[PDB]
Amino acid sequence: GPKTLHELLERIGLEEHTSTLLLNGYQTLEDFKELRETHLNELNIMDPQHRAKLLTAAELLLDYD
Amino acid sequence: GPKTLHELLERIGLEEHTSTLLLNGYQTLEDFKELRETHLNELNIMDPQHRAKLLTAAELLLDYD
């Protein structure tokens, strides 16, 4: 599957948040596995669609590595 | 990661759609990889949140097997 945070984001079409995530501790897929909702609140990532895609991706990333 | 369609759905919290999906050709994770939006339209799965979770999961399932 996608090998970089950027590649992951591109795949679910949310590369617009790449620069946000990396400036606040989300640089690798390994970091991205640790994402949860209140961080999205803090990052002002408030679109419920974006948020559902992001958290679903993180959960499945943790599950299937 | 989750090994059954039902386990996957449970994980992203959408087990309510299990019975829908299986009655229309989505019985395994292998089948679920083939999901796309217009099938959700046909299955009257119209919540945009549910739909984003479902399709994100399917895309990532295809990508990381």
Side-chain angles (χ1 to χ4, degrees), chain A residues 1-3 8 11-12 29 47-49 51-54 56-65, chain B residues 1-3 8 11-12 29 47-49 51-54 56-65:
Chain A
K3 293 183 179 179
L8 185 55
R11 172 52 167 141
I12 69 178
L29 310 167
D47 184 339
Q49 280 268 322
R51 293 161 66 98
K53 285 174 160 188
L54 293 180
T56 293
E59 294 158 21
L60 292 195
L61 225 63
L62 195 152
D63 286 358
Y64 310 87
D65 268 10
Chain B
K3 293 183 179 179
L8 185 55
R11 172 52 167 141
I12 69 178
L29 310 167
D47 184 339
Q49 280 268 322
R51 293 161 66 98
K53 285 174 160 188
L54 293 180
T56 293
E59 294 158 21
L60 292 195
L61 225 63
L62 195 152
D63 286 358
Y64 310 87
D65 268 10

Side-chain angles (χ1 to χ4, degrees), chain A residues 19-35:
Chain A
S19 296
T20 304
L21 294 167
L22 71 86
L23 280 159
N24 322 272
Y26 299 100
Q27 310 173 22
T28 71
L29 310 167
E30 226 54 43
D31 294 304
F32 186 82
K33 298 183 191 175
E34 322 163 344
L35 188 75

Side-chain angles (χ1 to χ4, degrees), chain B residues 8-56:
Chain B
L8 185 55
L9 292 166
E10 282 182 326
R11 172 52 167 141
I12 69 178
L14 294 165
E15 53 275 307
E16 51 180 79
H17 299 298
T18 305
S19 296
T20 304
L21 294 167
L22 71 86
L23 280 159
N24 322 272
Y26 299 100
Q27 310 173 22
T28 71
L29 310 167
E30 226 54 43
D31 294 304
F32 186 82
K33 298 183 191 175
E34 322 163 344
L35 188 75
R36 209 196 35 77
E37 210 177 2
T38 59
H39 318 92
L40 296 181
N41 289 352
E42 294 187 327
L43 279 45
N44 199 44
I45 309 201
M46 312 297 271
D47 184 339
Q49 280 268 322
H50 296 186
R51 293 161 66 98
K53 285 174 160 188
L54 293 180
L55 307 168
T56 293

